Amino acid sequence: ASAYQRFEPRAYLRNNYAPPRGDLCNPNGVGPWKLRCLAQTFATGEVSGRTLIDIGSGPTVYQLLSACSHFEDITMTDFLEVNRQELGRWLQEEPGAFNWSMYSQHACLIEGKGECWQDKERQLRARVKRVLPIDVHQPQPLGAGSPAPLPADALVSAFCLEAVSPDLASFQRALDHITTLLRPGGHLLLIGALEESWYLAGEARLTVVPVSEEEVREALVRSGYKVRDLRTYIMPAHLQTGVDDVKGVFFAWAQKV
Amino acid sequence: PDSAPGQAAVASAYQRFEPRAYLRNNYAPPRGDLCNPNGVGPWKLRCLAQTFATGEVSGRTLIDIGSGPTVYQLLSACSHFEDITMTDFLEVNRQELGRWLQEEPGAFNWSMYSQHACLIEGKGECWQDKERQLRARVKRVLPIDVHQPQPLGAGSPAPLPADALVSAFCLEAVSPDLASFQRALDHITTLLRPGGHLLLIGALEESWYLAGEARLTVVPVSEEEVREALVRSGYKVRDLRTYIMPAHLQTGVDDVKGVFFAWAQKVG
Numbered sequence: 001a002s003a004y005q006r007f008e009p010r011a012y013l014r015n016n017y018a019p020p021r022g023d024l025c026n027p028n029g030v031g032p033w034k035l036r037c038l039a040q041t042f043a044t045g046e047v048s049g050r051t052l053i054d055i056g057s058g059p060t061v062y063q064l065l066s067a068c069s070h071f072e073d074i075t076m077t078d079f080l081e082v083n084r085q086e087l088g089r090w091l092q093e094e095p096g097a098f099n100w101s102m103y104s105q106h107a108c109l110i111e112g113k114g115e116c117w118q119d120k121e122r123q124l125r126a127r128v129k130r131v132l133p134i135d136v137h138q139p140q141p142l143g144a145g146s147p148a149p150l151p152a153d154a155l156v157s158a159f160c161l162e163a164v165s166p167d168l169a170s171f172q173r174a175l176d177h178i179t180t181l182l183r184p185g186g187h188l189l190l191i192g193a194l195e196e197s198w199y200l201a202g203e204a205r206l207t208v209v210p211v212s213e214e215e216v217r218e219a220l221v222r223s224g225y226k227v228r229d230l231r232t233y234i235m236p237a238h239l240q241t242g243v244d245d246v247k248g249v250f251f252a253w254a255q256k257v
Numbered sequence: 258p259d260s261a262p263g264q265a266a267v268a269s270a271y272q273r274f275e276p277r278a279y280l281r282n283n284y285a286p287p288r289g290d291l292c293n294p295n296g297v298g299p300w301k302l303r304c305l306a307q308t309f310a311t312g313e314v315s316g317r318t319l320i321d322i323g324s325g326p327t328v329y330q331l332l333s334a335c336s337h338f339e340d341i342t343m344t345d346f347l348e349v350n351r352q353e354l355g356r357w358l359q360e361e362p363g364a365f366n367w368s369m370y371s372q373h374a375c376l377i378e379g380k381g382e383c384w385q386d387k388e389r390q391l392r393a394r395v396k397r398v399l400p401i402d403v404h405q406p407q408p409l410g411a412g413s414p415a416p417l418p419a420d421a422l423v424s425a426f427c428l429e430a431v432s433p434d435l436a437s438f439q440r441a442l443d444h445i446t447t448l449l450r451p452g453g454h455l456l457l458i459g460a461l462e463e464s465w466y467l468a469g470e471a472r473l474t475v476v477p478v479s480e481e482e483v484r485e486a487l488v489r490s491g492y493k494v495r496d497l498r499t500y501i502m503p504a505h506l507q508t509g510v511d512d513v514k515g516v517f518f519a520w521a522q523k524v525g
């Protein structure tokens with residue numbers, strides 16, 4: 001856990017959201033794949049409501065681009081101060097903010113409603129009301145009297161749980177911990193790494209639990225979800241880059257039942 | 258009768274045309290605000306994209322007539338032609354294009370326009386690929402005078418006759434009157450093969466516009482004047498659509514009342 005104390009936001013963004021993993025031009029890469037999963041799911045019309053929470057956002061916003069037009073109250077979270085600070089920089093268009101414009105643009109491309117990427121960002125920034133501390137290990141991940149409208153209509157989380165969990169069972173408990181924040185009938189969009197065991201964030205070396213698709217599936221069941229969709233992306237060689245050892249990325253669409 | 262004087266005034270005036278001021282006046286916001294779908298920027302891009310989307314405008318060679326310092330008019334086009342000639346009267350415009358071709362940072366930034374063309378062509382192309390394709394396909398930037406019967410000069414470099422022509426806001430902006438306009442249209446029509454296509458965009462009912470110190474003269478034309486000249490030149494008009502300049506886009510940079518888009522195919 002203390003390992004996340006060395007976690008460098010910029011190095012993380014560099015390793016994961018700049019080229020080659022950050023090149024959105026090629027349809028076969030992980031970035032486009034994730035954006036595609038998110039967009040397709042929301043285009044169904046079946047994930048809707050007023051409030052949404054993003055569990056373990058880190059310094060990233062890409063995972064809400066398609067989401068932001070189906071929820072007017074959005075809550076972002078992370079365990080580290082530095083990540084929340086980094087988010088603020090983008091939300092407030094402050095100086096030195098990370099540049100997400102390529103991703104906004106591509107979400108506008110994929111969604112295909114003729115939306116300009118500035119409108120897209122504008123809405124996102126508008127609908128994110130708060131950026132809050134959170135610890136999934138706690139049965140009440142958001143603490144007692146959070147300003148977060150509970151329970152949420154929907155949840156999103158990407159590359160968080162498996163990355164904060166020593167083993168399968170901690171991963172299971174965490175899933176249970178965040179699930180409490182989710183209204184019955186609500187939706188969870190879980191994105192994460194397949195069979196990963198470590199990744200680097202500057203001086204920080206983080207341990208990861210290597211999970212399989214079927215493992216992810218069963219965990220969702222055991223947490224009280226009906227799995228609407230589970231797809232896998234296999235990591236091409238050219239995107240195996242020495243920053244981690246992830247083999248693939250899973251996308252899960254689940255519904256609390 | 259004698260075309261020389263008017264043409265001379267025209268050439269004279271254009272010696273004060275300042276590319277940056279023009280780029281600013283016409284392609285920076287609000288006119289350059291690609292976010293408003295009711296805006297002229299988007300309407301122009303739509304007209305081009307939809308037209309190329311028919312698959313009916315095709316071939317090897319394309320010539321853009323009076324390109325000025327702008328490339329937006331070629332964004333949807335460049336996927337449909339291997340060889341594209343760009344052209345302008347003024348060296349300073351030609352140099353501007355050079356700066357963009359070289360991908361210099363001093364260049365005007367067209368990427369909003371690129372992204373927007375990518376958006377409405379609906380093929381999920383990224384804007385960097387679109388721009389790289391345009392830079393690859395532009396084979397040359399030539400001097401041009403549409404008042405000369407051979408607008409490119411004799412023994413020109415351009416592969417003639419072209420398969421297609423593009424021209425935006427050029428013919429009316431350099432012709433003192435309708436007869437001049439028509440002649441200019443006749444001239445460029447010689448560079449196009451029979452059955453070839455001409456995509457024409459221009460100002461409706463404009464008489465002047467600004468480009469720095471330069472306050473330049475435009476022949477005001479109407480849609481029907483434009484239609485007749487096309488027929489008069491040997492074209493079948495496939496499409497002629499009009500955009501009315503909204504008040505908030507009428508900024509004192511010109512007096513254009515609207516914009517026309519013509520898809521025409523040369524008879525022969």
Ligand SMILES: Nc1ncnc2c1ncn2[C@@H]1O[C@H](CSCC[C@H](N)C(=O)O)[C@@H](O)[C@H]1O
Nearest residue numbers: 056057058060079080135136158159160164
């Ligand atoms: N105990 C804990 N509870 C909830 N989040 C935690 C946590 N310990 C670390 N995190 C956060 O989990 C994130 C893993 S990586 C960030 C992933 C980001 N959502 C994106 O999609 O790329 C980090 O931001 C990290 O600080």
Ligand SMILES: Nc1ncnc2c1ncn2[C@@H]1O[C@H](CSCC[C@H](N)C(=O)O)[C@@H](O)[C@H]1O
Nearest residue numbers: 323324325327346347401402403425426431
């Ligand atoms: N006699 C002539 N023959 C051909 N082009 C001319 C000309 N005199 C001026 N031009 C060019 O006509 C242009 C009008 S401005 C339009 C530029 C660009 N195509 C656009 O769409 O914004 C200027 O570039 C100008 O230099």
Ligand SMILES: O=C(O)c1ccc[nH]c1=O
Nearest residue numbers: 016030159193244246249
């Ligand atoms: O953030 C990550 O760990 C990640 C994002 C996308 C693909 N693969 C990853 O490991």
Ligand SMILES: O=C(O)c1ccc[nH]c1=O
Nearest residue numbers: 283297426460511513516
């Ligand atoms: O005159 C122009 O250059 C012009 C008028 C209206 C819309 N767009 C233009 O470029």
